[PDB]
């Protein structure tokens, strides 16, 4: 009993600390993808699988790593519903912009008010899927963040499901690229 206890206790221990390893691995992961010039290219591998998980309702949307407007600027990321959200449910690829809580928010001007351009790159440089917008200053999505993330706001009808998938050049070798450009005017 003596050892049998001091044993399964070091195991529970061995497990708690394993959670602290997976966290640190993701923090490093987020760090490798972060940019600071307002430009971000998000590659989504295992496209087919992730589509299904969306259609099958299992996993409706995916968040992308974070990026900033400058070294100490706004922290942001994207969110995608490979099978639609709201008006584009089941018919369109929905793409959203997310204003996250940044470590420097106290130093930034609010509400967030930079033009944002969203793109679905054509892997044939022929015809990309592009759209843009200016923040709705009265929406809570662009108010100084209180939580980890604000409500995502963007293009629920960004791209017709058929357009991608099918064939074209958007999806190649089971992956797609999403590009976001945050206009830096004023910053």
């Amino acid at each position: 009993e003596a050892l049998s206890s001091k044993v399964q206790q070091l195991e529970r221990s061995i497990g708690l600390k394993d959670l602290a390893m997976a966290d640190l691995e993701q923090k490093v992961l987020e760090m490798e993808a972060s940019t600071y010039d307002g430009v971000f290219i998000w590659k989504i591998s295992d496209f087919p699988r992730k589509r299904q998980e969306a259609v099958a309702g299992r996993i409706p949307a995916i968040f992308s790593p974070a990026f900033y407007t400058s070294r100490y600027g706004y922290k942001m990321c994207l969110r995608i519903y490979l099978n639609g959200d709201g008006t584009g449910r089941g018919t369109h690829l929905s793409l959203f912009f997310v204003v996250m809580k940044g470590p420097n928010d106290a130093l930034l001007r609010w509400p967030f008010n930079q033009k944002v351009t969203l793109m679905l790159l054509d892997q044939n440089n022929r015809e990309h899927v592009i759209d843009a917008f200016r923040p709705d200053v009265t929406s809570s999505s662009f108010q100084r963040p209180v939580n980890d993330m604000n409500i995502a706001s963007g293009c629920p009808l960004f791209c017709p499901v058929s357009k991608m998938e099918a064939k074209n050049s958007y999806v190649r070798d089971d992956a797609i690229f999403i590009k976001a450009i945050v206009d830096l005017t004023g910053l």
């Binding site: 949307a61 709201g86 959203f96 929406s139 999505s141 409500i151 995502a152 706001s153 629920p156």
Partner: peptide, 7 residues
């Protein structure tokens, strides 16, 4: 911009 339907 149009907000997402929660999730």
């Amino acid at each position: 911009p149009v907000q997402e339907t929660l999730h």
